[PDB]
Write a protein that binds this DNA or RNA. Structure first.
Ligand SMILES: [Cl-]
Ligand SMILES: [Cl-]
Ligand SMILES: [Cl-]
Ligand SMILES: [Cl-]
Ligand SMILES: [Co+2]
Ligand SMILES: [Co+2]
Ligand SMILES: [Co+2]
Ligand SMILES: [Co+2]
Ligand SMILES: [Co+2]
Ligand SMILES: [Co+2]
Ligand SMILES: [Co+2]
Ligand SMILES: [Co+2]
Ligand SMILES: [Co+2]
Ligand SMILES: [Co+2]
Ligand SMILES: [Co+2]
Ligand SMILES: [Co+2]
Ligand SMILES: [Co+2]
Ligand SMILES: [Co+2]
Ligand SMILES: [Co+2]
Ligand SMILES: [Co+2]
Ligand SMILES: [Co+2]
Ligand SMILES: [Co+2]
Ligand SMILES: [Co+2]
Ligand SMILES: [Co+2]
Ligand SMILES: [Co+2]
Ligand SMILES: [Co+2]
Ligand SMILES: [Co+2]
Ligand SMILES: [Co+2]
Ligand SMILES: [Co+2]
Ligand SMILES: [Co+2]
Ligand SMILES: [Co+2]
Ligand SMILES: [Co+2]
Ligand SMILES: [Co+2]
Ligand SMILES: [Co+2]
Ligand SMILES: [Co+2]
Ligand SMILES: [Co+2]
Ligand SMILES: [Co+2]
Ligand SMILES: [Co+2]
Ligand SMILES: [Co+2]
Ligand SMILES: [Co+2]
Ligand SMILES: [Co+2]
Ligand SMILES: [Co+2]
Ligand SMILES: [Co+2]
Ligand SMILES: [Co+2]
Lengths: 104, 87, 100, 99, 99, 79, 106, 99
DNA sequence: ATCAATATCCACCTGCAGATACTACCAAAAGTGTATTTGGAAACTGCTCCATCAAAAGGCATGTTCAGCTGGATTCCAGCTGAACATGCCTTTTGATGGAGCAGTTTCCAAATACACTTTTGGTAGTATCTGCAGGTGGATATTGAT
DNA sequence: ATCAATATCCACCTGCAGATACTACCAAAAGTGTATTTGGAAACTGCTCCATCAAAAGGCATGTTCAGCTGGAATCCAGCTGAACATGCCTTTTGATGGAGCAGTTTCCAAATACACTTTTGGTAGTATCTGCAGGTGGATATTGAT
């Protein structure tokens, strides 16, 4: 019985407990901490795959590529802030042209 | 037999059409003639700084080969985190 | 198989893939996208583990507990992401402890 | 009766084209040579994983694109549409790459 | 028979006076009030160490002083000598606070 | 009120130290909102440090730690 | 105790403390004997660098005691110290006298 | 009186020592010394944290002076890096060569 | 230029906030002496991937020029809007004093680490076999700039 | 306003790069149990410093006048964009090749940990002395703005 199944999680509690020890963050790592962290991490993955899947769909694609991840993140105020100092390779920018630059 | 050719003036391989394309992606409509040399100047500083840290990491590992991880660590420590190349 | 045995390079890909199937059952992911996704989870893992690390220190605690992760999540994430992540993680710890 | 688009029409068209794609916009070899040159002035006899160089390109083109956005925004503040060296310098000063 | 200084003479005089000193320039109590009022929405019945409020004021005035520095640069970029909301807004956008 | 207790002459003094000569009328209100957002961001984080410590009093150190993580490190209160 | 590790290193800065703090700090499983020495030396040096220039600053303003104003002048007037402390605020330090030329009389 | 003492340690006495070596006729306010204590703690944490990372990138369980030295090179600007590197090797030598 | 008004400078002064100085006591920090444990440098070497060249196109995209349009730089000008200015008063500062709560101390147990079989699994390796989509296609709509 | 010279659109084609689908084996990871240790929650206390309000202090809200800065308008022209025109030694792409150097493995020893014991010490805490400079003055001199 994995601690993953036991917490209702697809992400690996055994690995996250492990990576927390290996990384010298504190002297002791409590039993709930890796459970809570694997949940947060899965929550956030699920959130970004949702938005990215949609972006895939909006462009008639069934395969998520980096463009989709980028549209997902940059179009979402919160993921955009959280990843405001990150660069997604092969993601491009958002189509945006400043008003004054259009003719009249 | 040993090749090794001299590398110089390679900043001018950053052509005027390539700078124009980057300006387009960045949404720029009109470009003054002095932009191209300004941009090359700016790129060189950028590259100098990342390569420096990147190569510092390489040397620390006692390697002669600059890995994608050296760049990624170097970029990360300058607050320009990159996804797509590992670690 | 096996060439002097290459040391194993572990990632989150099979788990990112499970979760992908849950939300978009007919959608796939390129290896490049899976690479961005694996970078993202590793990234966020480090940012939270380090706010946790710091917190513990600031309070003379030698243990990172779920209570350290929780505050780290509230420091790190914005608005709705923090609220939703806190409840999913609380959920998982409640469910985990009531099971023996 | 030969045909001519007016100044600005192909520019706007090019913006749409390039905002729409994700392909790297500097050619690979020229860029690789510039990396090898700059790195060689820091330390001789260096080799590069091909993806160390692609990482530097991705990072470099992303930094440059973002800077022109800021730069464009400084031109427009000055009631212009032409990016000038002094717009870049203002961008970089506020950004803290100068002060 | 009365005596008047030209517009700008006293402004310059103040710039010189205030750049020379280091004293906090917002009065303490209004600041303490505003701090507590903002804090109250995150948690009720809070007390504040007095050094907690001094640190918030130090940090806040340092931020606003430096932001007026960038704002002034943005005004000057647009060939003005009067700071406006658009200048503060340009600064914060390029600083990555609005971005 | 409160935000309005951050007076026009106080905002003008900050501008002066910032090297500012002439000031648009609309600036004082713009300066206030900017300051509000600044204190909201830092205090939020400081109070999250207080709650963790199971205290009812915001300490200088809660503030200093919040400022550090906003990338606005401050020297002089790290006792 | 024979000699402190500081005097063995020629240092005013506490090698024992720095060593202890590198352990208590969760930076690695282990800490070699030389690292606390190296780091204490680096810390002392940068201290000396800042006190030097802020000492100079005090003199220039006809004073014998270093106040935070002097540390601010010292640091901001030095290109390298100013870069190292580019995201730092020195409390009660103020600013450098600087007025944009376009704002100057007539 | 071992009660209300929970020992708060600081660099203040070691900073004061170095003051006298460089400026024997010069004093320092409490505020300014508090700032200097912050400087050392900050710089300590930055250097210590960068070495931690280096040791980790390279699968090493130990922070040696080599990690401190690379951390200094990565962290300090040009000339400051040079002398600090020179000071630290100097102190290690003096320490290794000591009876 | 004239020159009155007022800001600014410097010297000398003095009182006191805060800096020094010295003695004292005390935990904990720090060094010294001694078994024992192990990270990781050193030597050997498999085997991945980097540098290099050949040699074409898969010829793309660039550099150079020359035209001429129109955005930028200049100039002037009106009126609008912020700078200067003056002082009672109404708010902030400064000092005074309970009592909240932070910080100190001690108690004990739920959950931490150690650690040994036993079980489970993700990574990889290696071929084996689908499929989404780039890239080419026509060919039926959309925009632009000259009238 | 029409419309012709072009760019753009979107859906339906193909060949293949790259993605998912096998089954294998296995070292490492993860679960389970047991033996032993301890971090920090919890309950209690005292005194430190925080909120409150004594009055004593002084910065600023107010309106009015107008200097001068800012935006609007008009002009001019050069520096920019669009496009033709010749052609990379120029980039891309393909593909093979040798071989540097990274990374797997084993050995083994210097230096780390661990721990016990001695002694040294920095932080805290009164108690006393003492001094740098802030903020007072006076008298000189420079700056500014109306002539
Ligand atoms: Cl826990
Ligand atoms: Cl320019
Ligand atoms: Cl505005
Ligand atoms: Cl060492
Ligand atoms: Co959202
Ligand atoms: Co600490
Ligand atoms: Co919600
Ligand atoms: Co060279
Ligand atoms: Co790592
Ligand atoms: Co030197
Ligand atoms: Co006279
Ligand atoms: Co004089
Ligand atoms: Co006296
Ligand atoms: Co006193
Ligand atoms: Co070993
Ligand atoms: Co012409
Ligand atoms: Co025009
Ligand atoms: Co104009
Ligand atoms: Co007029
Ligand atoms: Co008005
Ligand atoms: Co009392
Ligand atoms: Co009392
Ligand atoms: Co109580
Ligand atoms: Co408490
Ligand atoms: Co109890
Ligand atoms: Co399996
Ligand atoms: Co495979
Ligand atoms: Co297509
Ligand atoms: Co066609
Ligand atoms: Co048209
Ligand atoms: Co159609
Ligand atoms: Co294939
Ligand atoms: Co205990
Ligand atoms: Co006028
Ligand atoms: Co104007
Ligand atoms: Co080969
Ligand atoms: Co070899
Ligand atoms: Co190796
Ligand atoms: Co002592
Ligand atoms: Co005296
Ligand atoms: Co005296
Ligand atoms: Co004075
Ligand atoms: Co006088
Ligand atoms: Co006087």
């Amino acid at each position: 019985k994995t601690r993953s199944s036991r917490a209702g999680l697809q992400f690996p509690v055994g690995r996250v407990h492990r990576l927390l020890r290996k990384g010298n963050y504190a002297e002791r790592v409590g039993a709930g901490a890796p459970v809570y962290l694997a949940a947060v991490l899965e929550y956030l993955t699920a959130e970004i795959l949702e938005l990215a899947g949609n972006a895939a769909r909006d462009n008639k694609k069934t395969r998520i590529i980096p463009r989709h991840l980028q549209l997902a993140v940059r179009n979402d105020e919160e993921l955009n802030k959280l990843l405001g100092r990150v660069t997604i390779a092969q993601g491009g920018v958002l189509p945006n042209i400043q008003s004054v630059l259009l003719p009249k | 037999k040993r090749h090794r050719k001299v590398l110089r003036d390679n900043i001018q391989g950053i052509t005027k059409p390539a700078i124009r394309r980057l300006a387009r992606r960045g949404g720029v409509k009109r470009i003054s003639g002095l932009i191209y040399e300004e941009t090359r100047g700016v790129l060189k500083v950028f590259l100098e700084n990342v390569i420096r840290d990147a190569v510092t990491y390489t040397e620390h590992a006692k390697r002669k080969t600059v890995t994608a991880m050296d760049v990624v660590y170097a970029l990360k420590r300058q607050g320009r985190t990159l996804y797509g190349f590992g670690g | 198989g096996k060439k002097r045995r290459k040391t194993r390079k572990e990632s989150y890909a099979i788990y990112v893939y499970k979760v992908l199937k849950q939300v978009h059952p007919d959608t796939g992911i390129s290896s490049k996208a899976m690479s961005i996704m694996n970078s993202f989870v590793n990234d966020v893992f480090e940012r939270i583990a380090g706010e946790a690390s710091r917190l513990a220190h600031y309070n003379k605690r030698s243990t990172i507990t779920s209570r350290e992760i929780q505050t780290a999540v509230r420091l790190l994430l914005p608005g709705e992401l923090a609220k939703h992540a806190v409840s999913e993680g609380t959920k998982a710890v409640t469910k985990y402890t009531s099971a023996k | 009766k030969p045909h001519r688009y007016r100044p600005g029409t192909v520019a706007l068209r090019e913006i749409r084209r390039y905002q729409k794609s994700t392909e790297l916009l500097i050619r690979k070899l020229p860029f690789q040579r510039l990396v090898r040159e700059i790195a060689q002035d820091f330390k001789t006899d260096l080799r590069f994983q091909s993806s160390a160089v692609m990482a530097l390109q991705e990072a470099s083109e992303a930094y440059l694109v973002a800077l022109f956005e800021d730069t464009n925004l400084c031109a427009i503040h000055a009631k212009r549409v032409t990016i000038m060296p002094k717009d870049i310098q203002l961008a970089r000063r506020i950004r803290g790459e100068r002060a």
